Amino acid sequence: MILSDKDIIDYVTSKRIIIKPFNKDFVGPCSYDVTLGDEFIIYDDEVYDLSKELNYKRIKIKNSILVCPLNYNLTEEKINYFKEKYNVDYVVEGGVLGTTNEYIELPNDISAQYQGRSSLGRVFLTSHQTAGWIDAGFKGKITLEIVAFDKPVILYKNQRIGQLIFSKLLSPADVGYSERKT
Amino acid sequence: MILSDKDIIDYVTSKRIIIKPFNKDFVGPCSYDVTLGDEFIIYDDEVYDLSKELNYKRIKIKNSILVCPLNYNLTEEKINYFKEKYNVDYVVEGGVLGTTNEYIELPNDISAQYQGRSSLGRVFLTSHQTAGWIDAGFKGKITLEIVAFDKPVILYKNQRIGQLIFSKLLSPADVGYSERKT
Amino acid sequence: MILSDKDIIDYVTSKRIIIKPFNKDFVGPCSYDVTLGDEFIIYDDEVYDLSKELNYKRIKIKNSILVCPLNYNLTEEKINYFKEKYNVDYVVEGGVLGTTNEYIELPNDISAQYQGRSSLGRVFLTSHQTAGWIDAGFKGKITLEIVAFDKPVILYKNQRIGQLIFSKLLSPADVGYSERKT
Amino acid sequence: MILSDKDIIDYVTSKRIIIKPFNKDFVGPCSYDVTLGDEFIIYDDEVYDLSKELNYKRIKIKNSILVCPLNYNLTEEKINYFKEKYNVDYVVEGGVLGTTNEYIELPNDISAQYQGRSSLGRVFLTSHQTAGWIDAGFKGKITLEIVAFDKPVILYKNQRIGQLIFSKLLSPADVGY
Amino acid sequence: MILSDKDIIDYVTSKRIIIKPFNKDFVGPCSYDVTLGDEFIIYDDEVYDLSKELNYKRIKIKNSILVCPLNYNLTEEKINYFKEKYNVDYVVEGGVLGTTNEYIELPNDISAQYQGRSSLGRVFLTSHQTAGWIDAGFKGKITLEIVAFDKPVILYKNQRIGQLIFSKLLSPADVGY
Amino acid sequence: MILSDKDIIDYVTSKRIIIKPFNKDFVGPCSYDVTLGDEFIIYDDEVYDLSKELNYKRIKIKNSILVCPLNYNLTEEKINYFKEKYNVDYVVEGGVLGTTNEYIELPNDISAQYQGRSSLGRVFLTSHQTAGWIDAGFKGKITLEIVAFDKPVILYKNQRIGQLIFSKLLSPADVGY
Ligand SMILES: Nc1ccn([C@H]2C[C@H](O)[C@@H](COP(=O)(O)OP(=O)(O)OP(=O)(O)O)O2)c(=O)n1
Ligand SMILES: Nc1ccn([C@H]2C[C@H](O)[C@@H](COP(=O)(O)OP(=O)(O)OP(=O)(O)O)O2)c(=O)n1
């Protein structure tokens, strides 16, 4: 069973589900809208080998960024052309990592799924390529995997980028660890 | 909890969930198969800026369409080559918008998720790049975001293209508005 | 409602849900980790027409494989360069079919969703492009659709590749057929 | 998860839950009202020994019955007094077994609970001694255990006597029997 | 699906479930304790005929009441004996209607069941004849059907008398009434 | 959501729900049958005052007990008559407290309801005065409130006396106590 708006409000009110910052107007019929942070990550390696720590570069946009499909063959000329014509702060091609502004904490009886917003899916822009299910007990912001599959797409800082859908677990889960006191 | 075939039939029978047209043979163990409409949309802009109304072209296929991966570099020669060799009515590359033939209406206690069919996923053809969850209270046909990630794929008008999975909400949702009478 | 770790263990113990081979340490708060088999499939056709039986080649890796994004333009020189530098057994570009080592059987009251692991999504590598919901009653291994969307990614035989999330059905489903005896 | 009016309607429509006879007006927010049959059973043995076959007499009423609390001492004169004053066809004291008019069949994924009617509870008349849960897979009419705890109560043939609350099972049961 | 302490707290906080008055200390693992009001109702007619309007007397107690089993034969001397020995304000035999202090309102997606307090059950005192399920959409105080089955039992004004167990409905009900 | 036979089996196997002793044959479509212990408690005070400590006598039977309705007037001759005719070890009238043989422990996500056996309900014998819901987190044997409402009923040591219906909680409870 998926939590409706009424449930989302209840759980947030009692702190069963943490959402920071929380915006009551972001609560939908059965989901909670999340927004795009201004910090992005761009990898800098020939190939990705998870056995190692990948090399990357961190950038912060003032207002917007243009995400181009892979192999868009971006040149210095094309970049300045886009920045001037569309007033974007940064221009990237291929995959780029983003983050939600929202930090969340899930209880042991709730799992959440993140999904990119439909209006962006409509222009072939995704902010997550996997199902996006999150383990009960999870604490943190949501990492976004942004990729455009047709034409370059303009994304704006703080814009609604996706939604979290909350589902009840059949039973309380062992989140992986337990803590007590002296 | 996901609705089984028995539940799907019940809800459709009592009009709790509207599906038009409805085909009882499209009801699976825990989903409902939907079909591909003959109308598609192709955007025509350098970049996609959601602040504006995107430019596009509407096409209607007589029977089939060939969807090629992005940057397939389609030329007039290649198009006629495909149309003649595979008898396809249209040839496109990159993302293309489609629609289900089916129109649905969801009650305030049901959310639905659309997923592209497995047989097509098996050939790297997707008709939705996001989770595809639909808000309770939704009314309308399903918009498809079609993209091929390996080789061109032939799609046929009216073919089963995906499935809707229905989930119960924990509580009735506020669909966003309420209506009364004089 | 999604099954928690406690439920997963219960169902596996009573054989309601079959998982072979089963590793108790693969049970998470609300999912079960699956691993990557050593056999892969690569299609060999100009276009994919589902009306026919697609041509393909089966390969078996000794330890690892390098999955490059589509149109990576792999040459014999580049392949030997990768195999020597990263010690990979095979080098492929575009979509490649894989399989989980695990074979599963789902009861008539459970549906499962497969999702690629987050650590790999983080490097733009997916092992399924659709929602990945599996019908109740399903029996078999999970077919993986592997695609890299940014840079080549190294995958290792037997590594955890994704997770199965189990959901209860609202009612028992008709899996499609029934069997009796003389 | 208790079935709401809409769910009850759905399950009856698809024959997942059988209710014969069925009246849509008996469907409440989350229950289905059942009615009192005209047939009753009165045990005639000295004590109840479940290890033995119980003797009883079958009683059928035309319109109504007066249920008196145990030890009401129903003399021959008192019974006639009650029949003429309240127009009851039969007068009994202590326990009496009745039955719903409705015959039901439950699927392997539903369990139901029978509850006596609220209005009757308020006059200390009960139609069930136990909680009233009915196994998934059950088939049959519902046996009523009628007892009055304060003063005599008149029951009418075919009157609503209680309700069935339907609950979903977490998983399908093995209704082999 | 029965609501746990955390759920009850949430539903009361957002006013999905109304409970007036409300005391957080009455919230248990999966129920909410309710208390006994000082007002009771005693029927004064010879028999219960639901087809007619019932006559009754309104009784209000200051502190406590002694509930005796039916046919306890409460002579004038016995009543005074009980009042002086147990300091009860009123002595009654057989059934007596009471009410919870708490007024509740249930949403269209919740049904509740009232259950008599365990400690009282152990002394054979019941405060409800039926299963106790309350329709989704219900509004009002809970009517108590009090009867003692073994020996007289003293009940105190405002004491915890039972509990409400809340259950989720599978779907929203049509609480038009 | 009520647990089905398969769920009960799973929860007992993983020790989520403790039942000692446990017999797989007692698992029904959606319940678990419990049995009658040989120990009973009979209160010996004039009235029940929960504000005070209750006096009682401990009774243990070898094989069976005869439960008579209240005010059955069990003279010395009547008792011997019943013992010799029905081979019962003890004869009591009114309420008697019993206990299940089974000891249980419930997890923070399950609540259980005890219900008296159907066959016994049909002979107007009840083993619980309240609805019977048991808090999540509970540990212990189940106390039985036995009362006969029609005629004397013979109960046998170790016989199935009722059943436990297990329900899932919507969320985990805070079973601190
Ligand atoms: N008030 C009642 C009483 C009984 N029954 C039904 C359900 C029971 O399963 C059946 C009686 O079965 P048994 O005669 O076999 O009684 P048992 O005690 O021997 O078995 P069980 O405990 O399963 O009822 O009748 C009913 O619908 N309403
Ligand atoms: N112990 C009780 C008894 C009753 N009620 C409430 C719920 C009932 O719906 C209402 C009584 O309604 P009616 O007077 O209309 O009784 P009816 O039998 O005629 O209708 P119903 O079967 O719906 O109760 O009072 C309650 O909260 N506690």
Ligand SMILES: Nc1ccn([C@H]2C[C@H](O)[C@@H](COP(=O)(O)OP(=O)(O)OP(=O)(O)O)O2)c(=O)n1
């Ligand atoms: N038939 C019964 C009666 C009681 N109990 C258990 C569950 C109760 O929580 C406990 C009795 O607790 P108390 O002695 O504290 O009774 P109280 O009324 O004071 O508290 P509570 O209302 O929680 O029971 O015994 C049981 O399993 N079966």
